[PDB]
Structures are given as structure tokens and as C-alpha cells.
Design a protein around this ligand. Sequence first.
Ligand code: HDD
Ligand code: HDD
Ligand SMILES: [Ca+2]
Ligand SMILES: [Ca+2]
Ligand SMILES: [Ca+2]
Lengths: 671, 673, 355
Amino acid sequence: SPLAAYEVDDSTGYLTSDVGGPIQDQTSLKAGIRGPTLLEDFMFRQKIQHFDHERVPERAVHARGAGAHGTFTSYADWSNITAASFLNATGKQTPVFVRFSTVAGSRGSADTARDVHGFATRFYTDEGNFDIVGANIPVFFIQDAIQFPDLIHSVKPRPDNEIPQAATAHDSAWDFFSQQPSTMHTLFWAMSGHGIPRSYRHMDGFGVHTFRFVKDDGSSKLIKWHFKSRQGKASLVWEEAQVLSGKNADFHRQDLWDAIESGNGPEWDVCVQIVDESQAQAFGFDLLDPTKIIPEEYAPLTKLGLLKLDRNPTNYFAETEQVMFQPGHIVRGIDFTEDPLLQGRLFSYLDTQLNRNGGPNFEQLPINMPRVPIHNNNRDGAGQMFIHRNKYPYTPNTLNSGYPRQANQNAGRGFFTAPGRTASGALVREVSPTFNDHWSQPRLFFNSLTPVEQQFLVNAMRFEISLVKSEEVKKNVLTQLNRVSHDVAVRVAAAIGLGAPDADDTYYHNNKTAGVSIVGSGPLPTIKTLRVGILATTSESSALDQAAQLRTRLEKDGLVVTVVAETLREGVDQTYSTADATGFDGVVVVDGAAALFASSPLFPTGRPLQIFVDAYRWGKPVGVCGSEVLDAADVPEDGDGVYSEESVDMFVEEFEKGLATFRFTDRFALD
Amino acid sequence: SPLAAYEVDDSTGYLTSDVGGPIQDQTSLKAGIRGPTLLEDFMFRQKIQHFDHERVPERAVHARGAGAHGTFTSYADWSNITAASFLNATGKQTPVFVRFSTVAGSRGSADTARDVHGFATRFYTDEGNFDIVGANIPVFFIQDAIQFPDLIHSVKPRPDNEIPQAATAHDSAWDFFSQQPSTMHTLFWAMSGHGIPRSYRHMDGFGVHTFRFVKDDGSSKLIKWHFKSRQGKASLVWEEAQVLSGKNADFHRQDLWDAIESGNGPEWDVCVQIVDESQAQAFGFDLLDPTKIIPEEYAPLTKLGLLKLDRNPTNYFAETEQVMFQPGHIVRGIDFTEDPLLQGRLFSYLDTQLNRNGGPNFEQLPINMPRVPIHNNNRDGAGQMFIHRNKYPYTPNTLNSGYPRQANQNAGRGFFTAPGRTASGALVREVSPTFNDHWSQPRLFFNSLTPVEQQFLVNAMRFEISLVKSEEVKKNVLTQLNRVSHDVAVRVAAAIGLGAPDADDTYYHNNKTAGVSIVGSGPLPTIKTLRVGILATTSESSALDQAAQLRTRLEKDGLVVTVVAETLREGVDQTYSTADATGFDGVVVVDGAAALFSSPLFPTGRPLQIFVDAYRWGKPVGVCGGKSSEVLDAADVPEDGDGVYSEESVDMFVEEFEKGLATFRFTDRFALD
Amino acid sequence: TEQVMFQPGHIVRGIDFTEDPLLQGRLFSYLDTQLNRNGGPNFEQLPINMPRVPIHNNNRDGAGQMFIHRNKYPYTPNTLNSGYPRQANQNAGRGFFTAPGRTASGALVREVSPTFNDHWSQPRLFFNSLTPVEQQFLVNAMRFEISLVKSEEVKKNVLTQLNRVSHDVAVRVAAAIGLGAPDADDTYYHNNKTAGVSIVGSGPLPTIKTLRVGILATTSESSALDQAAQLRTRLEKDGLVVTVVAETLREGVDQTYSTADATGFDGVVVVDGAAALFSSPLFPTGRPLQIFVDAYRWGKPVGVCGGKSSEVLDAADVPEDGDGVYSEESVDMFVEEFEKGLATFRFTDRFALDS
Ligand code: HDD
Ligand code: HDD
Ligand SMILES: [Ca+2]
Ligand SMILES: [Ca+2]
Ligand SMILES: [Ca+2]
């Protein structure tokens, strides 16, 4: 609503200055037709000054990201467990804005870099903005917010030459991981398929930290936020993600945009794990430690409501660039814990927005405004957009009749700290001994991946560690890996021509936990929005008909279908020149096109076959609809996820189960 | 190092605050061991506040770029054409700093996006900092500075969703180009190989605008700045640039950094075309028009001196991120012309630094300081570093004895505007009709490309234009292209399924100019720094020995060799898992490795695909050891192809392969329309 | 008030600039300086700076961007937003336009035009147009300021300049600083005068509404408060702002002597029942009288109301027959005479002139 009021329409009218004076902006005012430009040309200077000043500093982390508006709907009245107003009635709807992001890249870096991902959600509640500034991955790299700049420095480009962009595949990062063992758990997650998700819709969201739900009577329980995707979980393979980074840097933002535009907005079940205060240390680790999960085995999820994203921004800069999230945006009914990572975060987000906005009034930007009235004594500052009528902005006052009133546990639905919370002991800069096990949970995570998933994770480490220059850092990395799993270290060391150190089983175990594997999560529950590339030819009128018949049959099941040929024409969406296997979730070759797969000026040599071959190498469902063609490709007709049918209807029935399975993992060699 | 004075050493010592108090920075102060963090913890807040404020706004354009220090050395005493002090004596040396960049992409975007490129040079002269803020391409898109935000909005990502990053391949850019025909010239350079240069070192530099050289006697001449690369000109191919963008987004900055570190700092001859004032309209077009070149046939280059980059920065943020160039940094001996694109630039560069630096004292940053005393009455402002002794900072004064003194043509070596310059006429926002021909010079450019270069250009157009959604915009684009060359409009039209409109020959001609063709500038004058990848194997003790012998021989000639194998060990630099054809200018397979041409250690087909990509992208490729037919047949590479090598002898192999590296690209391998 | 960001560059169709070199440069400064003040480029979006008509342009982004722009093709020329916003000029859209008869000719110069070289005749025109008393005030101001310049070469330099405007000003100013003026230099002397530049000579004020009347009274005498109340009623029905001062505050009393001062009023009236005040823990010694003497010495109308006036006038050393000095028994006849003095505003005959 603050959003609609500030929309500006330029679909009609004459050019004006920012003060409403009609003007032109196509030619400079000059002293003669071939003369120098004039200082008094105010039209020139106001336009160029605005241009000179368009940029604002990028976020210190999560600079590359994309957002969408939507709705959260509560499933019940949750007053039994929380005082939160947005959760207080069945069907109660609250508007949201979500931004998704990578962590390390600058603002024009590729969506498909291997990274941890941000998932930040704002609830515009009727008791104030509430932000959950969360992740695709449930655990964080470090145990104390004071270490955040050390971690970020080491993962961001080397500061002498600023290389490499958006990547942990360099000496400093692995130096840091190998010296700071708290990093192991998140490192394993970022090195698994979670670090290269197929889209934002296909990842979960986590609050990471333990928070509190606080009832109106003052009792509290400990919670973890889990946003469970209704789209299913899916990842790219590394070799594909790299190619994508170069063919389409905007892949996730495009995906999110197109999904919303076509009536396929993504959905998540907003859940919590709920446990009592007395369980803080009961699960074999400390719930204040943000490098640990509570296994679903020990605490099941409760579904609180539905998060849907269904409307794209009108102006990316005003909305997605300017949105300023804060864990300090909290509402009555939620409270913090003494998690030292969370504690420090609270300071940074208030402070960093002065850098981004250049002024203290950043909560006045329409995207940051609340949906309820604002009553407070904050005044002045650069960019002040309000005109305050209260001329006695101090408490206590009589001159404004004691208004605004103080709000607290008793009065005005005020936020209040959980009254059971205590502190005791020395004032210390000490790490709690309860935080010292850095290795068991990464091992638990590794144990829970499938063999092929475990191979991708080894291969991700082999790829990155093989890029570290320093022999010493490489040894130190094997030393830490070895403490999670001797086998991982052995397999990683084989690729870099070092010996692993000897097994040190202090942290080894064989336990698994549910819901952390991508492959093990079964086929996608929907295939709407998946992309099919039909490779075809303009040489053969049969090929274009086979393509058009396939199209209409695939399009009904909500697939995004692209017909590729040599040149554009009615029915053909893309040329071979611009097509790549990374553009598709499945590739079908119509047999009418068999000639193309054996040279042309309209595209690079071998392109049509390379699309098909890349798709197959990368685990994707591939088919031919009419063969011989499977041989030019070296693709075995009998392989799973390879479809050969003469029939159009049976091709599609079969191929769609492919899309659902999504990736065919038997095509990947194991150690 | 020229900025040694401002360096901070942290190779020893205990951590301190910014005010010198020794502290720790690894654990927050808590009320109890599992307690909440205390507001009184200043160590935490100073450290996080700094981090929270590390970012500054990126440049409005040319956000993505990289820089290095060097030296300029004058070849002569140039007082016969200019009063400029940095050009006044043979062998006079002046510290420079240069920054290269793309134009449209944000920080983080890929070096090998197709784009125009920035080439910005600072000369820290004994008479003030002088900046030439130039380009890799000699002509700009538009003829009046006021249109810059229109050009930049149309080519930058669409503002509802911010897509696509660093790319002109979308409707808004082509709408602009088709509606604004001044764009055609620059557009044809961008669509050629100049849009995707092999490295910063393989591109030329241009001032773009006509400037003036001014002598101490007040006479002047019109100049164009040309920086001619001593490394030769080389481009990538589009299909390769795209893969590189994703395999190494840092490709040009790394190429530059490594070149300087290995003692191969890149060089340019800094040159000018000089012409008389009265030739402003003599060459068939207006010298005030930044969309036009003076063909070299009409005004030859004079070499003024040598530009050499030979030192990397110590801190990228402090040096490269913060360097703030301005065409307003001008020195006596040089002046502006009435080019309306230049005239307006003067305003923007001074203003935009307030944005980046967040305060008025940006010239006090070390990278922006001059190398001579500053005497002026500028005072205060946020971030003021100086402590000025003169308490009477106004002119005229007697209380500081009339100092600082006024500098001008006749006293103090003052800057002065060329005394012969005049203005006459009405005060107008009109375009000179001498600027109206937008098409003859893009046609001149197209004609001077070899037939394969012309095919690449057409293919870059087909690639981008086929991605424009709007059929109207696509039609409007063929209309403009058609005014340049009917042939280009036909061939592009074919890719997108639309008829080219009827020939319109007002601007067609057959004229050619020297020195704009990359593929026709002969073989590279040097191969030092070029990258050779040797594919090899650990299965065979003999493949690693062929690789070692081959390494030794190639490295002798200053080439950068990478041995690739399944796994690293002594003498192996990279695994197949990380290697790609984009990492090399030439690929050799040692014939001990024939068998590789499936494993858990690299994706299926990777070794063969490296060789096949290298061949398909025009690179010299070969097989060394003497048995070649098994590698070559697996790859479908004919043994007698130009740029395909097979020899038993290491010595003989290398001599032939080095000729291929100089040819650089084997253009016989790409189809023509 | 603090955020309002004025610009001479905020101009509308029908007005234009001239080549005044002072004006010309100002045009650059005000656009640039609001970046400093606002800390970001969107300062026209502050409420006080907003226009009252629709804004249609392709300016975007920047810190503090309050607008959410619909148009996703903010470039000209475009087809994808149908060529909107349209260009405004002389012939379409009521565009601003530079005055079409303006031209420039000549060298590009950093030179002062010689037409600007007479710096002295107009200051002399101005000085000649002030009354004798106004002349003394101007001379006194210079004597005040130049007497605080430490540099004896600066004072000499100042006399040289003043001398070219008026020898007499130079001589009169030099007398206050013990320096001799230099010899008359009459290149720019003249006798012309001009209307409209004198304050003391622009007549009595055309209105006295809002002028401030201090009524000095006492709580010792309840008839002094009655006299003050009576005086209040008849002054306020003419729109004067009236303040009754006494030792302490009570009904009818606005200010205490402790906070009262002659700078707080345009006229001072003492009610004759308060004559005794003219020492206490409640205000500084001599305060009630000093209020009266100050107002008198600054040329304000002053008076005593009620009929016994000589105790007050004598203590103040104010002559009963002086212009601007009123003494009447009747409140009504008092107010009528006093209100004429308020309009005269200043009684210039209380200040000495150089011979
Ligand atoms: C004390 C430093 C610090 C620490 C320990 C963290 N962060 Fe943070 N975070 C920031 C300091 C920060 C920041 C510098 O303040 C950012 C940059 C821009 C902004 O709004 O805040 C930020 C941005 C940011 C964003 C982008 C918000 C958006 O899209 O606009 C997300 C999703 C996260 N963070 C999430 C996390 C998670 C899940 C953490 C660990 C559990 C975490 N942060 C720890
Ligand atoms: C009226 C505005 C305007 C116009 C018409 C131009 N530019 Fe510009 N240019 C800018 C306004 C600008 C800017 C917004 O002021 C930048 C961004 C940051 C900065 O320092 O200046 C800039 C940056 C910039 C850089 C980056 C310098 C660096 O590495 O920091 C280069 C090389 C150029 N420009 C070169 C050109 C060339 C060759 C042009 C046409 C001949 C041109 N510009 C026209
Ligand atoms: Ca590093
Ligand atoms: Ca577009
Ligand atoms: Ca600021």
C-alpha cells in the first residue's frame, strides 16, 4: 500500500524536471550551432547529476539477489504456542516480500556460482514488520558474530588483485576453513548439491538460529524456522552450473520471474521445530550453537502456514535493491536467544543500512515502511519525508498529554523480552566448551547423502582444493577433512597427489538423518515450469510438424517448451546459435532433424549434437521422437532417462516421468 | 613503489583498534559463558561497523575493471606542437596508472562479456595530473553528452527485474540503437572482434574526441590520441568468450596481473593524428563529431612516447576501486574542443566522485594525489586530511601577501584556453547538420574487415537480434542496418525470419581503411605470455616425460605452460576436472596419453573435449611424440589442416607450433554465408 | 524550513537568464550544494521541495529513491514506451525555452568586461540619498568596524577605497581611528540622489499593528495595575502587542522586570502610580529605570501616563517637551499621541552629528 501510493506513471505526457517544469533532454544548450556547452543549461545538469548519482553501495554480503512480493497465510490460531499476531487465526493473511541471494559475489556476478544462499522474508504484520533473514542451508560457518568479517574476507576475492569473483576456490578460503574447524558443517552443505540449487523455488529456507516463541502469559519455548518448498528439491551438476554462469548469469532471477509471471508462483510450508527451554542441551549439542541442526528424528516439524510468492516488483532498484532487512525487526510473541552469532547480527543490520541509504531514514522507503501507523519521537535526519505535528517529542511530557504511551508486556501489545531469561557469571570473552564438537554433524550429514551425492561432494572438494596454490594449506585442509571422515580425505587427497593422514576416529559414526539429501528426496512433486528444448530443423517440414505436435502436448502439462532450429520463423523460438543444453531440463530431438547431427554459418560447428550430448552427460532426460541419432551421440537407447518412441503420446507420458526424476545419476562414475 | 608513503605493514605485531589500543577480535564479551553479548563490547562494534561500511557505490559505467601502475617515457621534446611538460624532453619519464574495464556490467560481471571497453590513463606529470579517459574503440555511440543516460539505460538490465547482466542482447538496447542512428559506427565495432578482445594488452587505446595541442605561443592544432599496442591485436570467438565468462569471470584481470608479475608488462606507443584548425571540416565530416574517425590515409600517426605497465597494485580497493579519473584533469599544452559529447563529460566526472567518495575531498586519496605541491584556497569539507597554515584563504588579499599567485598564459605556467578559440551565433539546443551522416563510416569499417571477420560480425548481430522479443524493434533494426549495407541486412534477416527491406544506397561505397581489421593485422609480434596446455596422463611414466621435455622447450620462449593430468603430482599443474580449452591459446596432447582420447576424477569425455573445443575455436593444436592418428581421428581433426601439428621431435614440434601461436587463430575452420 | 532547497535553476517558461557572470555561476552551485545537504540526489522528493504538478522524466535510482517507476524503458528515443515522455519546447508541451534572440560572439575569454569598472559612483549615489542622521549611522557603523581591524596597512587601504566614494566619509571615518584620510580624489564624486533607498526618509510606518508596547507598572499599588489594564485595553484595540511588566507575575502582568528589556518593545510607557521604582531581590538594580532610559536613548517613543510625570522624567533625564516624549493624564489622549510616535518609530533628534 505504501507501494501503490508512490507508483509513478509515465505512459503519457511531456518531459518535466523533478520540479514539474516541462523541458527537453536530447540536445545541450550551446553558444552557436558548433559552440561550447553553457553552464546555464540546467536541463543538462539535472539529468546528468541524477545519472552520476544513480548507484548506491552494494550489500556487504548477498549483493547478488532477486525478490518477489507475496502472501503468508496462517493455518491456525497459534496462541497456544505464541503471542504473534500474524499467526493468531486460521486464514489470517499477511503480505510478504522475499529476497533470495548468493553470499560472496558482487552485484553483477552469476546466479549459479557455488555458494550458500540467502532467503530473507519480511512479514508486513498488523503489529509491525517482522523479518526472518534466513538461508538455504540450516547451519552457519562460524559460532560468533565477531568472526563474520574474517570469514567474508577469506571467501571474497584476494584483496591485492580482487580475484576470484564469487568463489571459495582459492587459498585464503581454504586456509580459513582449515584453521577454523567450526566451518566444516556448512562447508559440507555448500560442497554438496545444495551449493548449486536448480532455482530459488527448489530450495528450503532456514532461520538457522534457535529463537523463542513467547505466549502472552510470558512462557516460552525454543524454535527453529524451516520453510519447506512445495516445488521439491533439485540441484544442478557442477560442470553445468559453470557453463550456466557464462551463458546466463541471470538464471535464478529469470526462473523466479517467469514462474511468477505464468501463474506458477513458488510456495513453502512455513514450519517450526518446537522444544522446551529445558531441552537446550538435551540433544547432545548446544541449541545456542548455530553450526548444529536438531535432527528431525528428535523434533518433528509443525506446519504454521503457507508462504506464496505471486507478484514481481515494478522497479527492481526501488524494491529489491532498497529492501533493508533486520533480525531486529521482531514482533511481540518472538524473542532472541543467547546464540552469539545472532546476538551480533542484531547490531550489524541496523548499522549497515546507513551505508546503503546514506542517511538514517531508510525505514521511510516505501519497500521498508510498515502497514500500521508509526508513533514515536524520532526526528529530523537527512531525507526526512514526514512532517511531525507533535512539537513535544520527549517522554515524560505533559505538553503532548503523555503521548505516545509506553508499550510493554502489560500495556499496548508491546514487545517484551521472554521474562524467564537470565544471565549469570563472569563477563567473559570465552567460547563455551559446549560448542567444541565441530566434526560429528558434518559426518552425520555426509553419511546421509546417497553414494552418488557423496561422489559429487568429493568431486566439488577435489575441484576446489586442486586450485589452492599452497601445499601447506592443502595439507591443513586434509587434516580437518580427515577428522570428519577418513574416506573423504583419502578420496580428496588422491586428486591432489598428497597422502591423507591416518584415520582419527574420535568423531566418526555411522548415523544418518532424514531430509538432508537432494537425490533421496524422490522425484519432483510437480514438473510445471520445467523447460524442454526440442531440437528441430527448417530443412524438413516433417521436423517442424513433429516439433509443433510435441509442443502442444508438453505445454498442456505446464512445461516451458522451446523449439530450436537454424533460423527463426513461426513455431521456432530460438536458434542453435543461442541455444545451450543449460537452457533446458530435458532435450528432445525430432527425428526429421537427423541430418544436423553428423557444419553451418548460422551456428558453431557441432552445436546441435553438443546440446544433446551435454544434456545427456549432465543427467537430464533425453529423447528422440521417431533411432539412428542415438548413435551419433553415443547415447545408449536402453539407458534410464533415454526415451525412443515412434509414438507422440507415449514419448510424452514417459519423458514427463523423466522430468519428475529430474536427474539420472547412473551416468556418473564413482570411486 | 610510487605510493610507498601510505603503505601499512601487518607482517608483525599485535592487533589494535584504529586508535592504537591492543585488543582481541575473536570472541564477543558476554554476560556469562552462554550469555547475551554486551553493548559495552567496543572491540566487536568497531570491527563490525567497519565491515558494515566497506562498500562504496560502483562506478555508474565501467564498474568492472582492473588497473596497474607504470611509466610513460617521451620519445622527444614535443615543444614544437605542445607546451605539455610531460612531453618536453627526450626520455622524460612520468609515473602513470591505467584502468581497463567493460562499460555496462556491474562489479562481479564477467570480463569477457561482449562490450566496448574503457582505457583510462593517468599521467602524474610535474605540472599536475593529466588524464586521458579513453576507449578500446575510436568512436562513441552518441553525439551529445545529454544522451548518455538514455544510451546507458537502454543497454543496462531492464529495470523491472534487472535482466540481462552485461549484455546488449535485449529489446531495449536494440530499440535505442534502431531509433538513434548515430549508434551504428560504435555498434559495428562492438559486434566485431573488438567487442571481445583476447586481453587488455591486445587492444588499442583511443581518446575518441578531437582535443587540441597548444604551444607556449598560443597557436594550436587538432589531435586524436591513439595508443598502439605493442603486443598486437587479438580477439576471442564468441562461443569461447561465453564459456570463459563462466569458467573464469576474472580472465582479463588475471591475464594483466600475471603478465606484469612474470616481467612481461604490456606496452603501447602513445600516438596522435595531428591536423590544422582549418581542417575541422576538410575530411568529409566534422572533427567535433565523436562518431567518426580520421582515416589514417589522411593523417598519419606521430609516435610521442612509450607507455609501459609494470607494477600491480598492493590493495585493489585503495588503488583500482578508488582511482577517480576526469577529463577535467588537464595540463597546460592541452585543450578541449567544442565536441558536445566531450563538453558535457567535463561536468559529470567531477560530480560523480561525490557519489563514490561520499565527500568533496576525493583528490586527497593517495591514488588521486598529484606528485607536486598544492597551493589553493579550497577548505574543509568531510574527510579533510590537510591542515592548512594560511589563515587568509581568499584572493585578493594582502594579509597573506597576495599568495597564492594567479597562474595564466604569461605567469606561473598556468593552464590557458587556446587563445584562437571563438564562439558565434544564437544560443541553441540544435544539432549541427554536419553531424548528420550516421552510416557511411560504419560501412567504411565493414568493408575493411576480411571476409571471415565480416562473418563474425554478422553472426554477433544474428545472435543478439534473434533474442529481441519485439518484431517491430527487429524490423526497425533491419531498417538501420540496411542503410549501412544491404548485404548485412539480408544475412541478419535470414537468421531471424524476416525479409530485409529494399536496398537503400544513399550511403553505400567500396572504400576501405588501414588498421581497423584484427584478423588482417598479420601474426602477433610476440608470443610471450601465450598459454599452452599440455594434455597428458599419470598412467604412463612416458607421457609425463614428454610433457616435461615439452614444458622445458616451450618455457624457454616465455610461453606459459600448464601440464594437465587426471590428478596433480610433481610437474602436473592442473587436473582435467578444472581444465578447459578457454585456459589456453594452444593445446598439445603428448602421444603417451592417446588412451584418454570415463573416470570419477573428471566429467566424461573431458580430455577429448578440451582438444575438440580448442580446434573448433581456431587454436593451434597438435600431438607430440610421433603417433598422432589415434588422437586426431577421435577428434575429427585432419592431420594436414593448417594449425594442426604432428612431429616426433620436441624441437621440430615447437618451432612449427610457435608459428601457429603467432597466427593465433585459424580462420579456415569457420563456415561463410 | 531547514530542508527547503532553493535554486535559481528552478525556472519556468516565460522567464530566462541573462549573461550576468554572478548569476551564471550560481546556476551551478545550488544544484550541486543540495547533494551536501541532503546526502543523496533525491532531495526534490522531500515534501517541501516537491512540485504540485505530475513529474514525467527518466531520472532513476539514487539513495533515498521514494518513487516506484512503472515505465521500464526510461530512455529517449524509444518505441517500447511509445516515445513517452514527449519532448517539450517552444512549440510543444509548454516547454521551457531559452530566449531565441540571445546570441554570443567573440573569443572564449577569462576577462572582465570594462563596462563593469566603475565601482564608486553608485555607492556615492546611495550615500547622497540618505538623510543626515542616516549618514551619521552609516559613518558610525564603519567607525565601529574599522576601529577593530588590527592591521594599520588594512585600515589605510580601506580609507583609500572610501575616499574614492566620498572624501567626507573618508575624513569622518579616519577621525575615529587616528589616521589622516588621503587627499580628495573626485573622479567619481557627484551629487545625484535617488528615491526609495532611504529608510528614515520613507515617511512614518503605514501601519502600527504588531508593534510592541512595554507598560512598566508595579504590584505595590493596585491603582498602577488599574492604570496598566486601562492602557492595555485601548492599545490592544489598535492591534499593538502589549506587555505589562511588574516586580512579579500575577493576573494582568505579562513579564517580570527581571526578564524585561528595552529591546523587547517599540515604545515604553510608565504608569504614574509606579513612580517609586524609578532596589530589590527580584530584579537587577536600576532595571525599571534602565528600561526607560534605554528606550529613550535608542529613539523610541517614551511616556508617563496619569499626569504626574516629572519624578520619572527627572530620574531618566528625559525632557518633558522632547519630540517623542509623552505625558498626559487622560489614557485616551495619551494613546492617540503615543500611536503617532510609534508610526514615526524613531526620534532621530536624540543622536549627535559630526559638525
Ligand atoms: C555481524 C555480521 C553478520 C553475521 C554474523 C551475519 N550477517 Fe547476514 N548480513 C550482514 C551481516 C551479518 C550485513 C552486513 O548487515 C548484511 C549486508 C546487507 C544487509 O542488509 O545486512 C547481511 C545481509 C544478509 C542477507 C541479505 C538480505 C537481503 O537479501 O537483503 C541474508 C539472507 C543474510 N544476511 C543472512 C544471514 C544468516 C542466515 C546468518 C547466520 C546465521 C547471517 N546472515 C550472519
Ligand atoms: C555525460 C556523462 C558521460 C559521457 C557522455 C561519457 N562518460 Fe565516461 N564516465 C562517466 C560519464 C560520461 C561517469 C558517470 O562520470 C563515469 C563513471 C565513474 C567516473 O569516474 O565517471 C565515467 C566513467 C568512464 C571510464 C572509467 C574510468 C575508470 O576506469 O575509472 C572510462 C574509460 C570512460 N568513462 C570513457 C568514456 C569515453 C571514451 C566516452 C565517449 C567518448 C565517455 N566516457 C562518455
Ligand atoms: Ca587467495
Ligand atoms: Ca529489455
Ligand atoms: Ca553521505
